[PDB]
């Protein structure tokens, strides 16, 4: 099957109903309005990433004008066929010499079910207990392709000897969002100039499944071309020979060919340096250390917002996509898709997907956003420090601080995002002030609620008083 030609993309009308499956031309060249549709948001984010990558190599705009233009007006079918002509030899899922993101002639003693490409359906001792069986019985060509791209990027590797993506393990992906999937995909594609100014010498620019990675290689990251990188494939995988006509045990849709298993084997290399992937933010820390953002804790999403939308030169570097959009449309609001996993080796601990919102001022007034976030985390650490003091001393005997942190976070969910999405950055001092107050009384309430059951015993009331002292110290220091 070929991505650029046959139809795989699962979509439903932006506001319409029943689901149909289309091809690239059906998306690029028509004014129909489409939204993606799978039973899982992570696979939707994956698919979206795939489309963005494809569109990135086949149709970078000449300049912002053509950019906006082609966002407002679909292509013809022939500049479609134009643009996709040189690349059709690349995207064949089952091919005779170059299978898409696969490696041919793979030696494995056993066949691993398709489940292992489905992030979280298995790979943890409790999965056989909470999850429904047989989601990996027979997969769409699209289901499959999407799964493959996903594992090669945002999902956690299989483990033992299977190296992770080029961004590191479990990165966070951040795409700008438009009115329908077409405009989305286009909105997350770099223009030709920008593309060139983000890739600076005999740089191999061929896919991994065409010119392979040699074992134990020592690749300079700089020598990787954007095409070779965007479709990087750090594993040695090979689909098994498809089954007859049936139902995507993942999609719930019918398709002529379905995949029932695959072959993998351990493979190692090393990519020295940091490849400037344009879909993920990048934390910078000089002790210099560059590393792509990844969900580390179970905290709410608003705690990561500053790392997603704010540049800072320690410092921070948002994805290229978002800052392109920052330059191109400095008068437009932002609706940003953000997603990723949180993992313990091959085990999914937590899956995250959000669609953050920000009115106009977000491109220039970054400092306000960082203000909000750091304020929230400030109050959080106030509460935590205080209740830790209650717990240990300088002791109550019981730790209550984490539970209280949970409560806090849950109420913060109602508070902070609302502020970010509806505030006028131009003049935002008073909304922030209010936030500070409500957080203040939230910390007071939670402190008292937490120590409440133990304060019947005097000896505890002593340590409680001390704790309360440190609490109000921290709280008062949060008032500018």
């Amino acid at each position: 099957m070929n991505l650029l030609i046959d139809n795989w993309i699962p979509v439903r009308p932006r506001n319409g109903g029943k689901v149909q499956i289309i091809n690239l031309q059906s998306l690029y060249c028509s004014r129909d309005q489409w939204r993606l549709s799978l039973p899982r948001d992570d696979m939707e984010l994956a698919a979206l990433a795939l489309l963005v990558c494809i569109g990135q190599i086949i149709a970078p705009a000449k300049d912002d004008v053509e950019f906006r233009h082609r966002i407002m007006n679909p292509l013809t079918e022939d500049e479609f066929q134009q643009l996709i002509a040189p690349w059709i030899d690349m995207f064949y899922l089952n091919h005779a010499e170059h299978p898409f993101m696969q490696t041919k002639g793979v030696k494995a003693n056993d066949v691993t079910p398709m489940e292992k490409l489905l992030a979280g359906v298995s790979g943890a001792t409790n999965c056989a207990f909470v999850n429904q069986p047989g989601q990996g019985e027979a997969l769409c060509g699209g289901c499959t392709a999407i799964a493959l791209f996903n594992q090669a990027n945002q999902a956690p590797g299989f483990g033992g000897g299977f190296k992770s993506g080029l961004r590191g393990g479990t990165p966070v992906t951040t795409f700008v969002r438009g009115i329908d999937l077409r405009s989305t995909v286009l909105l997350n594609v770099l223009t030709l100039p920008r593309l060139q100014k983000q890739f600076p010498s005999h740089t191999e620019n061929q896919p991994t499944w065409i010119k392979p990675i040699k074992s134990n290689e020592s690749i300079p990251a700089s020598s990787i071309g954007f095409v070779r990188g965007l479709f990087w494939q750090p594993a040695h995988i090979e689909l098994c020979d498809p089954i007859g006509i049936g139902k995507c045990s993942c999609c719930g849709q019918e398709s002529n060919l379905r995949y029932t298993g695959f072959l993998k084997e351990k493979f190692t290399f090393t990519v020295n340096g940091l490849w400037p992937h344009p879909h993920s933010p990048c934390l910078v820390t000089v002790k210099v250390e560059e590393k792509f953002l990844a969900f580390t804790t179970s905290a709410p999403s608003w705690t990561q917002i500053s790392r997603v939308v704010v540049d800072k030169i320690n410092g921070n570097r948002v994805a290229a996509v978002v800052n392109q959009f920052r330059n191109i449309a400095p008068q437009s609001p932002l609706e940003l898709i953000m997603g990723g996993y949180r993992n313990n080796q091959a085990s999914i601990l937590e899956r995250r997907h959000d669609v953050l919102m920000f009115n106009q001022g977000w491109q220039q007034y970054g400092n306000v956003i960082n203000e909000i976030v750091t304020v929230g985390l400030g109050y959080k650490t106030a509460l935590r420090k205080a209740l830790y003091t209650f717990a240990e001393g300088f002791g109550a005997g019981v730790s209550v601080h984490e539970t209280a942190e949970r409560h806090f976070y849950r109420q913060s969910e109602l508070l902070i995002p609302d502020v970010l999405a509806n505030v006028n950055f131009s003049q935002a001092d008073e909304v922030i002030a209010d936030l500070r107050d409500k957080l203040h009384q939230l910390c007071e309430m939670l402190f008292n609620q937490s120590v409440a059951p133990y304060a019947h015993h005097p000896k505890l009331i002593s340590t409680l008083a001390l704790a309360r002292a440190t609490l109000y110290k921290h709280l008062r220091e949060l008032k500018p």
Binding site: S37, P39, R40, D41, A119, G120, V121, A124, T125, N126, C127, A128, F129, V130, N131, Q132, P133, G134, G252, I348, L349, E350, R351, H353, V355, T403, R406, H407, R410
Partner: protein, 218 residues
């Protein structure tokens, strides 16, 4: 203009799902459509493989949910959350066979002090009628519960029955009023919507598809 059935979902603890294939079992701030469909589907004696009855019920019925805040002794009580470290020992290792883990662990969230008032009605393509529903809610065949089987009800499932044009307007006749409402049916004055993944894809066991609520703030 249109007849409405009015239910009340209230108990000590409540659990309404969110997307997960992991051991953490999340909860949202108000009942899910899959949840409500499951509740009705439970009062009605609908076995799990009866995809026909499931579908019938799904395409027949539509919901609008209102969040009631608690007032006790005249002080307001916000809805709070609870996390339960829930273990299982002797849990199955594979979907086939008898080998088991020593111990596995799951974290399950519940809602505390939550109370809801729901209004449901029939769609144009309905295969059912309201008094089947009423009759079931008053005499369920399977045990009903708020999310999980460990969450009983403190109030009868049936609240009342009336008629009007809005779901809103129907809800206005049952106190307490002033809560936020999430309806499958648009209301002219209000433009806000709330994205969810409530819709159960009956053709595909235990999978859900995106949908959107209409939000009518109080």
């Amino acid at each position: 203009m249109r007849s409405y059935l009015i239910l009340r979902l209230a108990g000590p603890m409540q659990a309404w799902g969110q997307p997960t294939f992991e051991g953490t079992r999340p909860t949202g701030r108000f009942p899910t459509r899959s949840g409500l469909l499951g509740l009705l589907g439970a009062c009605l004696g609908i076995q799990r493989d009866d995809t026909s009855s499931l579908q019938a019920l799904s395409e027949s019925v539509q919901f609008a949910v209102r969040c009631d805040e608690l007032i006790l002794d005249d002080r307001r009580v916000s809805v709070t959350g609870l996390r339960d470290y829930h273990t299982v020992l002797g849990a199955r290792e594979d979907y086939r066979g008898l080998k088991s883990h020593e111990t596995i662990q799951t974290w399950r969230e519940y809602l505390c002090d939550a109370s809801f008032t729901v209004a449901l009605w029939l769609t144009p393509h309905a295969t059912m009628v309201i008094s089947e529903l009423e009759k079931a809610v008053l005499k369920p065949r399977y045990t009903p519960y708020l999310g999980r089987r460990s969450c009983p009800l403190t109030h009868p499932l049936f609240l009342g029955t009336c008629q009007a044009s809005d779901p809103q307007k129907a809800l206005l006749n049952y106190e307490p009023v002033g809560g936020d409402i999430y309806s499958e049916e648009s209301v002219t004055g209000h433009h806000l919507k709330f994205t969810a993944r409530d819709e159960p894809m009956i053709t595909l066991p235990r999978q859900f598809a995106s949908r959107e609520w209409y939000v009518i703030k109080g």
